[PDB]
Design a binder for this molecule. Structure first.
Ligand SMILES: O=C(O)c1ccc2nc(N3CC[C@]4(C3)C[C@@H](OCc3c(-c5c(Cl)cccc5Cl)noc3C3CC3)C4)sc2c1
Lengths: 228, 12
């Protein structure tokens, strides 16, 4: 049994989460454009920039986020972005997409100048997330939880952030005992994946280092959320 | 100077 407040919170979040769209201007490129590495990298750069917009729109609308210290709000976006991005792509790769999209998107990522060192962990993480057979509820809440991690670099008031995080952890723990009745592990299995998810903070840093020594260029929004 | 992030946060 969820409380009446925890039912108000979860509606506030799945409303927030289901506005997350990738425009067709961009999805149509998966199938339409030529297959070359320059073109693949560019398709991903658009995809990234548009999603980073959508992520700041989601984060903005989290309960209590607006109340937070201004320098901390930034530390939260910058610390959480890589994780929130890889979690999203994991939802996308375990979801029914239009015909051919799953397959060709994969092929594009696989020929976009990303070393095999990092392609591998990427797709075995998507497999791993696939097996928890998650719901939109759980994607939304995990994403929300990841964003409001209080233990990122730079954060000045941890307690403030804890206070917004803990409510969401509560709702997710109670949802794991409801919709997965015969397994008390589901919730600690989820939190277990966040460890694997946290490795992409290194993989993605290398992905960029490598991209940059080959004179590739990113949008000014991506440059901001991903710098120093 | 993360102007774009500041901008996206304060908006509507
Ligand atoms: O086909 C559809 O209908 C459909 C619908 C939604 C939808 N959303 C998509 N995405 C959500 C975030 C997404 C893909 C963009 C990210 O990739 C871009 C990216 C990444 C990146 C990758 Cl490589 C994987 C995971 C996380 C990240 Cl940071 N690293 O650098 C870049 C840019 C080239 C510099 C991963 S692809 C997609 C497809």
């Amino acid at each position: 049994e969820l409380t009446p407040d925890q039912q108000t919170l979860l509606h506030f979040i799945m409303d927030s989460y289901n506005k997350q769209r990738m425009p067709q201007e961009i999805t149509n490129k998966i199938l339409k454009e030529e297959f070359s590495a320059e073109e693949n990298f560019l398709i991903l750069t658009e995809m990234a920039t548009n999603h980073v917009q959508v992520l700041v729109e989601f984060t903005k609308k989290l309960p209590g986020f607006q109340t937070l210290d201004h320098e901390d709000q930034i530390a939260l976006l910058k610390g959480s972005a890589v994780e929130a991005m890889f979690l999203r792509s994991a939802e996308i790769f375990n979801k029914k997409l239009p015909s051919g999209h799953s397959d060709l998107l994969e092929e594009r990522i696989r020929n976009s100048g990303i070393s095999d060192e990092y392609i591998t962990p990427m797709f075995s993480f998507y497999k791993s997330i696939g097996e928890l057979k998650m719901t939109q509820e759980e994607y939304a809440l995990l994403t929300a939880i990841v964003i409001l991690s209080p233990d990122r670099q730079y954060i000045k008031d941890r307690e403030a952030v804890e206070k917004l995080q803990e409510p969401l952890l509560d709702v997710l723990q109670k949802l794991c005992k409801i919709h997965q009745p015969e397994n008390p592990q589901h919730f600690a299995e989820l939190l277990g994946r966040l460890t694997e998810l946290r490795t992409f903070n290194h993989h993605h840093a290398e992905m960029l280092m490598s991209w940059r020594v080959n004179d590739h260029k990113f949008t000014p929004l991506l440059e901001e959320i991903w710098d120093v | 100077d993360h102007q774009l992030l500041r901008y996206l946060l304060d908006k509507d």
